[PDB]
Structure 1
Amino acid sequence: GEEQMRLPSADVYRFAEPDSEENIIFEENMGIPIIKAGTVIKLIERLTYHMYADPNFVRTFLTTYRSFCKPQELLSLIIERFEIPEPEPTEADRIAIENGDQPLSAELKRFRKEYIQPVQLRVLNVCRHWVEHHFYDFERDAYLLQRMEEFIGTVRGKAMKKWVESITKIIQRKKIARDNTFQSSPPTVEWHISRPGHIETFDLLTLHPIEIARQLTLLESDLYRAVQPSELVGSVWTKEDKEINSPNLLKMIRHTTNLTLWFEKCIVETENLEERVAVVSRIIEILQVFQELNNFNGVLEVVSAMNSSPVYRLDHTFEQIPSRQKKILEEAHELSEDHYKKYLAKLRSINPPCVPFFGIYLTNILKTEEGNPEVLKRHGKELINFSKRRKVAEITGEIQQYQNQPYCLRVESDIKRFFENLNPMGNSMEKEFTDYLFNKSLEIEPRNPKPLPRFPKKYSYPLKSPGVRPSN
């Protein structure tokens, strides 16, 4: 048909083959059709489609493409997409040109206006969205940026002039931003036994429990806000190149592991029962202040520490914990029950700012990654399951909706550093350290037939807590 005769030949262009059941699949369209699956070539073709813009697809593709296409390959494919061959002149125009006259070129002008110009401006739109929202690809690969700048810098056109200026404007802004707010007054920085500057005395019981929760919420808010959606796609934080692909997410996971294991270590290394009860009671108060601040990440870090194998079994310790703190800690656990039903209800019904629980997102993304195939098979051909990537992108979109919520709390550089540099494991591996904590639990509180021995005190300061009510 004349429609495919107008589009370029396959031997001069790869992005003009007609759609079929063996190269592209769509979802139930009840409007722009939603792409379920397709070859990389049909994904690139639709990413820069001549008939219409598709901001939703551009956003999803640029967040998830690294799971099926390398950044160097994506740039090559969009540049190949941009270089559209022009058709030959008609017979009458060939005679007109050979006679020294100007051709009519009716179909060539139509093809340029209705196909070459829209596809080229759509490739430029991908380049703009790429540098605006995923500039880290260019920071991790300076050669990729050199190729991008050479490409946009050699583009020649009247409508493409403004596009090339907007892309350049963004690249330079990002480059400078690499190097170089409070609506209300923040509260007074709380102190308990440790004095400001006496970093040598900073510890779980010497610092004020309000200030521990405040600084940890500030630290976790910054860690939460730095994670980009692509660090979570394709489960790249669990693969070989995880350090370069997921640096902000791995930092968040290592903080959560260090804080949780540090709380466990504080409890089980406090061998005197009366003192351990004080330690557990102080961590419950830290959780109470995390609840006040809507830091569900920290609340669930305390729930993980108390539910751990070494701590949960400490029946003699929790026996002396006041009934009200027992109830708070039990209700906090219930946040996780029934696939985090109460947690999700609390997150939606809360007023900002908040530090959501990050573990649930990682769990749900791993469920989506493992429970959906990388490709779909149609007529013996393999198509990239794009709906799989879209579903992971929707979960990361839920993460992004809470990343613009700064807290009105004053940073205390020394307390911040104390929590950034927590190393409970030391030179031990996680399995070695958790076995140590469990054997330590059995030492301080042996199994029921064996009795409870008495251990000496290790703290030369008052164990009484100053509480969770602030000083204003």
Structure 2
Amino acid sequence: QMRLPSADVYRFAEPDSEENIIFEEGIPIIKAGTVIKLIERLTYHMYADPNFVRTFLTTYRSFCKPQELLSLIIERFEIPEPEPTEADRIAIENGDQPLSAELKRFRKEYIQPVQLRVLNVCRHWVEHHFYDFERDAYLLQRMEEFIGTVRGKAMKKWVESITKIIQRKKIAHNITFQSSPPTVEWHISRPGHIETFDLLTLHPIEIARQLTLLESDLYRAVQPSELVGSVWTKEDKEINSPNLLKMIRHTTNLTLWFEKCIVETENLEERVAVVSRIIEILQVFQELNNFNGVLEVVSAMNSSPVYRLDHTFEQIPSRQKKILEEAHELSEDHYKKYLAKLRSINPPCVPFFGIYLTNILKTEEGNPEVLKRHGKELINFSKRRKVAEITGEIQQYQNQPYCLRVESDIKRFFENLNPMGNSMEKEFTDYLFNKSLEIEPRNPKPLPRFPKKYSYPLKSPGVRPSNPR
């Protein structure tokens, strides 16, 4: 049995009680607790839980301010060591050197792990949640002063390290692959002739690849700070969730572009060619595990303007109808099949972010911030663990990069796509629907004929990659 400092000179030694900490019914899992108890466990001396550190650092701002968090971990770090024991006093009083058995044990089993864990929190804080520091300069000065006060040849390794990470973070990612990326594919449009780039002139395989690289980069850029507290749904969403919104807006624009390409091709035969090309792009998206790409296509095919084009879908080959149907099925029954498929593939992949947003929002609106026990308001940590489980799954899929070569011009083409032009949403959306009524009138109005608009061959080069280089 090891003695702890007096709860009178060190606040993190109060014993655990149903009034300051609650556990979830293999390390313990915290359901709720006071901020002091949460910090104690965040830096517990008995076991490790890097998972706790990420959860806490990702979600603490709703129950503790940055400045207060720093003050508390500094207090946690400053552990008073015990007084010599009776055996030591005897030795000291005889003029001998004390064995200090308990002092040495206390340092090895309590002080060292607690202080190392506090420093670990500081390191992860600065390395992965540096925005707290970018937004508050005094907080950073306090951190630097603290790390700079840490004495001892032992802690030296970590002090120097954290100091360097901090400096690196203030003044401002190579990739190695198992294999070599496949060769870029070209169809009608040739390299350098960006003016000719379009849905049917670029190779469908390369369209899916370049959009996958683009969508992957957008997905990988979303930080947890843009999600916690449901900030993307609030009035300052543009300020707090810029990367998320940019990712969603690209997806929306691409869906609208697919719809536009379809309804503006008035000639039935050419429209059938346009729809088939888009389904081939979906097929490559599936091969690449770009789920965001797959749903962009499904969303377009199920939009009001396109969904009603019976004469067009009637001419689509069965193998393609099947492909579209199976893609559509991923979202049915609340994405049941999509969730099963995502959990089974081999990354890299580009997940559909929508699911995550809804789950985070509901977790936050359906759980209380605090649980009350005997008049005490304990932080509801299980709520935070649930949100961090979601941000954690998002981060896991953000790690693996795609082994595909970027083609600058094609990438530029898609970055600048603007189907809506200068029109407002409602007007553009009404335009697409009116175009749909024009090209395929409601029954019993007869189907009119329209002149061709494409002067180049409409035959698709297919979706199987070629291999010459």
CA displacement, residues 306-363 of structure 1 (integer Å, 9 cap, x when unaligned) = 1122221222221221221111101111122233333233334433433233333333
Q: Cα–Cα, structure 1 residues 125 and 315, in superposed 2: closer, same or farther, change >3 Å?
A: same
CA displacement, residues 91-112 of structure 1 (integer Å, 9 cap, x when unaligned) = 9999999999999999988877
Runs of 5+ unmatched residues, structure 2: none
Q: Cα–Cα, structure 1 residues 207 and 379, in superposed 2: closer, same or farther, change >3 Å?
A: same
CA displacement, residues 182-227 of structure 1 (integer Å, 9 cap, x when unaligned) = 4333322222222222222222122111110010111122222333
Greater mean deviation of Cα atoms: 203-212 or 337-346: 337-346
CA distance in 1 between counterparts of 2:421 and 2:71 reads: 46
Q: Cα–Cα, structure 1 residues 356 and 25, in superposed 2: closer, same or farther, change >3 Å?
A: same
Q: Cα–Cα, structure 1 residues 452 and 374, in superposed 2: closer, same or farther, change >3 Å?
A: farther
Partner of residue 402, structure 1: 397
In 2, are the aligned partners of 1:67 and 1:233 still within 8 Å (CA)? no
CA distance in 2 between counterparts of 1:328 and 1:63 reads: 40
CA-atom RMSD in angstroms: 3.8
Greater mean deviation of Cα atoms: 164-173 or 274-283: 164-173
CA displacement, residues 59-116 of structure 1 (integer Å, 9 cap, x when unaligned) = 2212222343343442233234334567899999999999999999999888777655
Greater mean deviation of Cα atoms: 316-325 or 247-256: 247-256
In 1, are the aligned partners of 2:12 and 2:40 still within 8 Å (CA)? yes
Greater mean deviation of Cα atoms: 64-73 or 418-427: 64-73
Secondary structure of the corresponding residue to residue 146 of structure 1: helix
Secondary structure of the corresponding residue to residue 64 of structure 2: coil
Secondary structure of the corresponding residue to residue 22 of structure 2: strand
1:241-390 → structure 2 map (5 Å cutoff) = 241-390=236-385
The alpha-carbon deviation at position 174 of structure 1 amounts to 4.2
In 2, are the aligned partners of 1:259 and 1:301 still within 8 Å (CA)? yes
Q: Cα–Cα, structure 1 residues 285 and 123, in superposed 2: closer, same or farther, change >3 Å?
A: same
Secondary structure of the corresponding residue to residue 25 of structure 1: strand
Q: Cα–Cα, structure 1 residues 38 and 436, in superposed 2: closer, same or farther, change >3 Å?
A: farther
In 1, are the aligned partners of 2:177 and 2:403 still within 8 Å (CA)? yes
Q: Which residue, 16, 20, 25 being the options, matches 2:13? A: 16
Q: Cα–Cα, structure 1 residues 195 and 109, in superposed 2: closer, same or farther, change >3 Å?
A: closer
CA displacement, residues 264-290 of structure 1 (integer Å, 9 cap, x when unaligned) = 222223333333222211110111111
CA distance in 1 between counterparts of 2:84 and 2:236 reads: 51
In 2, are the aligned partners of 1:233 and 1:389 still within 8 Å (CA)? no
In 1, are the aligned partners of 2:194 and 2:409 still within 8 Å (CA)? yes
Q: Cα–Cα, structure 1 residues 288 and 9, in superposed 2: closer, same or farther, change >3 Å?
A: same
CA distance in 2 between counterparts of 1:105 and 1:332 reads: 70
Greater mean deviation of Cα atoms: 261-270 or 210-219: 261-270
The alpha-carbon deviation at position 47 of structure 1 amounts to 1.2
What TM-score, normalized by structure 2, do the two folds share? 0.85
Secondary structure of the corresponding residue to residue 97 of structure 2: coil
CA displacement, residues 392-428 of structure 1 (integer Å, 9 cap, x when unaligned) = 2222332333333322322100111111222223344
The alpha-carbon deviation at position 152 of structure 1 amounts to 0.6
The alpha-carbon deviation at position 136 of structure 1 amounts to 4.2
Secondary structure of the corresponding residue to residue 382 of structure 1: strand
Greater mean deviation of Cα atoms: 368-377 or 81-90: 81-90
CA displacement, residues 376-398 of structure 1 (integer Å, 9 cap, x when unaligned) = 22233332221122122222332
Runs of 5+ unmatched residues, structure 1: none
Secondary structure of the corresponding residue to residue 32 of structure 2: strand
Q: Cα–Cα, structure 1 residues 179 and 278, in superposed 2: closer, same or farther, change >3 Å?
A: closer
Secondary structure of the corresponding residue to residue 192 of structure 2: coil
Greater mean deviation of Cα atoms: 380-389 or 132-141: 132-141
In 2, are the aligned partners of 1:213 and 1:286 still within 8 Å (CA)? yes
Secondary structure of the corresponding residue to residue 448 of structure 1: coil
In 2, are the aligned partners of 1:212 and 1:286 still within 8 Å (CA)? yes
Greater mean deviation of Cα atoms: 113-122 or 189-198: 113-122
In 2, are the aligned partners of 1:15 and 1:41 still within 8 Å (CA)? yes
CA distance in 2 between counterparts of 1:348 and 1:109 reads: 48
CA distance in 2 between counterparts of 1:355 and 1:179 reads: 20
CA distance in 2 between counterparts of 1:352 and 1:11 reads: 53
The alpha-carbon deviation at position 6 of structure 1 amounts to 7.2
CA distance in 2 between counterparts of 1:378 and 1:19 reads: 14
Partner of residue 7, structure 1: 4
Secondary structure of the corresponding residue to residue 202 of structure 1: coil
Secondary structure of the corresponding residue to residue 336 of structure 1: helix
CA displacement, residues 153-184 of structure 1 (integer Å, 9 cap, x when unaligned) = 12223332222122123334445669993433
The alpha-carbon deviation at position 117 of structure 1 amounts to 5.0
CA distance in 1 between counterparts of 2:118 and 2:172 reads: 25
In 2, are the aligned partners of 1:237 and 1:243 still within 8 Å (CA)? yes
CA distance in 1 between counterparts of 2:69 and 2:173 reads: 24
The alpha-carbon deviation at position 149 of structure 1 amounts to 1.4
CA distance in 2 between counterparts of 1:324 and 1:471 reads: 22
Greater mean deviation of Cα atoms: 324-333 or 429-438: 429-438
In 2, are the aligned partners of 1:261 and 1:424 still within 8 Å (CA)? yes
In 1, are the aligned partners of 2:84 and 2:100 still within 8 Å (CA)? yes
In 2, are the aligned partners of 1:284 and 1:329 still within 8 Å (CA)? yes
Q: Cα–Cα, structure 1 residues 374 and 427, in superposed 2: closer, same or farther, change >3 Å?
A: farther
CA distance in 2 between counterparts of 1:104 and 1:345 reads: 61
Q: Cα–Cα, structure 1 residues 104 and 239, in superposed 2: closer, same or farther, change >3 Å?
A: farther
The alpha-carbon deviation at position 296 of structure 1 amounts to 2.1
What TM-score, normalized by structure 1, do the two folds share? 0.85
Greater mean deviation of Cα atoms: 259-268 or 237-246: 237-246
Partner of residue 193, structure 1: 188
In 1, are the aligned partners of 2:2 and 2:106 still within 8 Å (CA)? no
Greater mean deviation of Cα atoms: 70-79 or 147-156: 70-79
In 1, are the aligned partners of 2:329 and 2:337 still within 8 Å (CA)? yes
CA distance in 2 between counterparts of 1:272 and 1:143 reads: 65
Q: In percent, how many aligned pairs have the same letter?
A: 99
Q: Cα–Cα, structure 1 residues 470 and 42, in superposed 2: closer, same or farther, change >3 Å?
A: same
CA distance in 2 between counterparts of 1:52 and 1:354 reads: 34
The alpha-carbon deviation at position 23 of structure 1 amounts to 2.7
The alpha-carbon deviation at position 118 of structure 1 amounts to 4.3
Q: Cα–Cα, structure 1 residues 229 and 414, in superposed 2: closer, same or farther, change >3 Å?
A: same
